[PDB]
Design a protein around this ligand. Structure first.
Ligand SMILES: O=c1[nH]c(=O)c2nn[nH]c2[nH]1
Ligand SMILES: O=c1[nH]c(=O)c2nn[nH]c2[nH]1
Ligand SMILES: [Zn+2]
Ligand SMILES: [Zn+2]
Lengths: 364, 364
């Protein structure tokens, strides 16, 4: 049968890498973008359509699903894959970051009231049946004092060890799924180093850079990535959580990131924002009312093969569900085409040229 | 090339008929159900999905489209078919009934203010490019005195003649589209007869029974159909406007109706009502939370091949767009499967048995 988790780097250019993760439910091409499910659905898209855009893996929202329908119910119904009709890999967040409430060394309590711990988070992700399980971590406020960022990071590292142990104690989970650790430490180099050291001493299948979708700005995000990603084991995937805009993704790949997730293409699609190679546009704008061109005249997606800006403009202005469907399909397809161009350009040793050409046009 | 409008009856059983309408953009199998578009979209469905359910023709909403985007704009963009991506026949209502405001012999004025006349309605439907054009008629209140029903019907008949003349004066329209007249007369037999006589003296490609989606109850609707449908030319299609529930459709076919439209499968789908051969169910009900059966265990639609009641229950409770998509696809598919069973049973001389079996199970 297929491997549980096998990461292979096919090509490099500078700090950028391209390759594959082989898992039992399929292959993930990296750098990868994971569409975000909100409540066991990628908003407005059937799973076949998600796959048709090129997605290899989706993110399942543990925070939402643990309350309704609940993890035990989803397990009774056959697991999240069967429930939502997506048979390929699913990555689940741990839930602790989202819900952040009172915390302690045991875990986090939240509002009627509920308690999440590393052990309960691993069990919930087990019941959901996800393929990549995230360690249970804390949300560090931004800005944070060095001392508060330190205490938060060190609690997260103790929770990472407990996540590792709980995962390993469930033999079906350990045999069939993968476990990722999450680096914290806010914007402070020495804390990011201590966090990386702790995670590597525990050992994980992949390493996420956490705590950088906190509104700090791209310059500062890139600064932190500059010193943080090289601290992580080179031979394991690097996952930048909650990022981001297309230009964020390009710059983060240039700094060694292999995996991404963000609600932007789905959320902003329903709200009228379409991503294009010439930058984002708001299809609700009256300037599109008679525009017969597709959302993007170089996009390969099914929406751009069949419908005009003028039609989609009309649908969104009218509040029509089909408007949200077409905008979301195009935006996820655009993100997947971006990742494909990234992967191809690294494989061909032309990623620096691509990144320069991309930015010149996207921000023209 | 293909015929403009050719209606053929293949088989009869009692007053029920089954056959085909051949038009330039395709064949319509009768008895037919037309999904209703709201604003150049069948809510929550791509045109390919509408076709996949079995639909041969859809209804376009003239009232909505004449305001936004406007008929002239849709024509500038290539017509309604190109605009929404549906290349098969479209029937458009005339708009007068919907908007009903002040009226006169010229037409109707409504709120900023606008005026619709028979000539303007035909022109709007021409600009949209529809295949079946409806004569411009009046909305009769229900209940109505005989005298008010008479004056309304006779104004509608004068408007039907003006609709005929305006249609015939546009040679591209007359060569490529069809024109249906609308019988009025409220619940009064003598007025229904005078209306039928007037429409037949003008001559139309098809004849609608208007004014029976006014809340009168099924018993009274069937009573009016009993004497009204035989007044219409036998050799032309009979269209019952705005009807209806599955049991309404079966009984109306038994009384000689060939065509139907209703917002029920789309509207009630988004609101949690699913049609099944055992009657309607509300998928939001907690009793479906762990039900792994499809919406209907005999339905052939793609939703029922892939997803459970429990999943769709979750989606609708969560407010998710995919919930509306799956409910609407199933409900339109159910309606199309109902029409297919009707057509097959008439063709096979088993429609009386079907109707009896249908009602026993649907209302068990
Ligand atoms: O967007 C984010 N999601 C998470 O689950 C997370 N965990 N740490 N940082 C995070 N950022
Ligand atoms: O539902 C209806 N729609 C119409 O357009 C119409 N016209 N007459 N009766 C009608 N009923
Ligand atoms: Zn596109
Ligand atoms: Zn179905």
């Amino acid at each position: 049968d297929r491997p549980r988790f096998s990461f292979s780097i096919a090509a490099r250019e500078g700090k950028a890498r391209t390759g594959t993760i082989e898992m039992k439910r399929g292959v993930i091409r990296t750098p990868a973008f994971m569409p975000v499910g909100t409540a066991a659905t990628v908003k407005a898209l059937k799973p076949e359509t998600v796959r048709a855009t090129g997605a290899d893996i989706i993110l399942g929202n543990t925070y939402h699903l643990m309350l309704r329908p609940g993890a035990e119910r989803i397990a009774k119904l056959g697991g999240l894959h069967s429930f939502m009709g997506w048979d390929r890999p699913i990555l689940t967040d741990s839930g602790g970051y989202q819900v952040m409430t009172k915390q302690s060394e045991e875990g986090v309590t939240f509002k009627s009231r509920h308690m999440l711990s590393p052990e309960r988070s691993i069990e919930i992700q087990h019941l959901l049946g996800s393929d990549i399980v995230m360690a249970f971590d804390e949300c560090t406020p931004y800005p944070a004092t060095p001392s508060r960022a330190a205490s938060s990071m060190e609690r997260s590292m103790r929770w990472a060890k407990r996540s590792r142990d709980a995962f390993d104690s469930r033999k079906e989970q350990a045999e069939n799924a993968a476990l990722f650790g999450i680096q914290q430490g806010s914007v402070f180099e020495n804390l990011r180093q201590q966090s990386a050291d702790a995670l590597a001493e525990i050992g994980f299948d992949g390493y996420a850079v956490g705590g950088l979708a906190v509104g700090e700005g791209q310059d500062e995000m890139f600064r932190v990535l500059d010193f943080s990603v090289p601290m992580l084991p080179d031979d394991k995937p690097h996952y930048l959580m909650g990022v981001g805009k297309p230009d964020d993704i390009v710059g983060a790949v240039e700094r060694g990131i292999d995996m991404f997730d963000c609600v932007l293409p789905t959320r902003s699609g329903r709200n009228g924002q379409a991503f294009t190679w010439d930058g984002p546009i708001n299809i609700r704008n009256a300037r599109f009312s008679e525009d017969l061109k597709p959302l993007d005249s170089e996009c390969h997606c099914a929406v751009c093969q069949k419908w005009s800006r003028a039609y989609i403009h009309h649908l969104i202005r009218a509040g029509e569900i089909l408007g949200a469907m077409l905008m979301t399909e195009h935006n996820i397809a655009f993100y997947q085409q971006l990742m494909q161009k990234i992967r191809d350009s690294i494989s061909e040793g032309r990623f620096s040229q691509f990144a320069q050409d991309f930015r010149a046009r996207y921000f023209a």
